[PDB]
Amino acid sequence: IQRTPKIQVYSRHPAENGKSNFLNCYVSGFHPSDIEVDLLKNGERIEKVEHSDLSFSKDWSFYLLYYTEFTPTEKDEYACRVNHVTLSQPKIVKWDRDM
Amino acid sequence: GSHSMRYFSTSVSRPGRGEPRFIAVGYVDDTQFVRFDSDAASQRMEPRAPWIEQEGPEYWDEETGKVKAHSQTDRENLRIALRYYNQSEAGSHTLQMMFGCDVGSDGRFLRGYHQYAYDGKDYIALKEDLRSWTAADMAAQITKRKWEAAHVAEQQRAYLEGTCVDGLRRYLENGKETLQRTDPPKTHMTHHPISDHEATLRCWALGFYPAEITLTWQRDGEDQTQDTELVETRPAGDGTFQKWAAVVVPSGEEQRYTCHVQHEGLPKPLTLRW
Amino acid sequence: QYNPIRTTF
């Protein structure tokens, strides 16, 4: 079986410029478990990203949380870049502080 | 007032890149408390919640031995499954296991689980009576017949009805300041004009534990599901969870709409209006 | 508390 990842990009806490926070990319509902997830700042790969321990849901599909500390600004753009065998090319999802 | 303990393992073969990778995690309710990763330097079961750090050295030795043995067993099971399904050694495959128990408010046994999935599909599962198996395809029936013959189910019952329940009871007491408490959702509503004629109301629930929550909209006090969007519950990353529910409304009618929040940490459900 | 898993398919 193969299932494509669902992706949510969001902050740990409500964004306010100049305040430390965490940028999260939650990938879920995918199979198999091999997956590539990058966090992007202005299109560039953020170097110190951590992730949760591989786990799965009752339907056996996998989920992982990727995260990094960040201080949002008015200017800076953030995103999550996901690749998986189900995808023909990496998927980029932009961070929107209202979602 | 029920509680659960679960162990989840994933074994992935990777021909050309060494022996299969094995990762196991343990949870009480929605709280992760241990991990083991075959690829990590530690080669130990490791704590992942404060309240398990109380366990002594013997615990970490014993748990480490048990999870390592499981890793080697499911490596052999990946090899066996390849033979049962007549699959090439060139390919990568996945064997997942889940096992654990549920207890009631009184701490006594309610349900046990012991089950596997191969390449994302059910393989074999112990049935609720803890004496019979559900086998999903002709390969799993070979295993089912072997396990019936060898009384494997009976062997798991002492663990599921005994050790599992006993461990969960101890963890619930030692970790009670989180595991037997709740974080109610922090809530608020935002307003987004999206056109001259429409606006989006978004109802936020943040920092709640456990993860179970219900967010619904009403219009004039009757359920509203048209033109709504509800995101899947998602981890904040700090042990708590997030969710939101949004509705598109005609500009000027915002006051007709209410958001309703139900959560174990709320004595009374909340009603939010713009 | 883990259950030692030793049973093969």
Numbering used by the authors:
A (entry chain B): 2 to 100
B (entry chain A): 2 to 275
C (entry chain C): 1 to 9
Q: Can you quote the paper on this entry?
A:
MHC class I proteins, encoded by the highly polymorphic human leukocyte antigen (HLA)-A, -B and -C genes, present a snapshot of the intracellular proteome on the cell surface (immunopeptidome) where T cells surveil the peptide–MHC complexes (pMHC) for antigens derived from foreign pathogens. The typical 8–14mer peptide presented on MHC class I comprises only around 2–3% of the amino acids in the pMHC complex and is spatially confined within the adjacent α-helices of the MHC groove, thus posing major challenges for engineering peptide-specific single-chain antibody variable fragment (scFv) binders.
Here we show that the neuroblastoma immunopeptidome is enriched with peptides derived from proteins that are essential for tumourigenesis and focus on targeting the unmutated peptide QYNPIRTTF, discovered on HLA-A*24:02, which is derived from the neuroblastoma dependency gene and master transcriptional regulator PHOX2B. PHOX2B is a key CRC protein that is among the most specifically expressed genes in neuroblastoma. PHOX2B expression is routinely used in neuroblastoma diagnostic assays, is one of two highly penetrant neuroblastoma susceptibility genes, and is the third most significant dependency in neuroblastoma, as reported in DepMap32. To target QYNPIRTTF, we developed peptide-centric chimeric antigen receptors (CARs) using a counter-panning strategy with predicted potentially cross-reactive peptides. The lead scFv 10LH bound PHOX2B pMHC with a dissociation constant K D of 13 nM and exceptionally slow off rate (k d) of 7.6 × 10−4 s−1. We then used our pMHC structural modelling software, RosettaMHC, to model the 3D conformation and binding free energy of peptides presented by additional HLA alleles, identifying HLA-A*23:01 and HLA-B*14:02 as top-scoring candidates for recognition by PC-CARs of the PHOX2B peptide originally discovered on HLA-A*24:02. We also found that although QYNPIRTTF binds to HLA-C*07:02, 10LH exhibited 17.4-fold lower binding to HLA-C*07:02, probably owing to a distinct pMHC molecular surface in which the sidechains of the MHC α2-helix (R151 and Q155) protrude by 15Å at the position axially aligned with the key 10LH binding residues of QYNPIRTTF (I5 and R6).
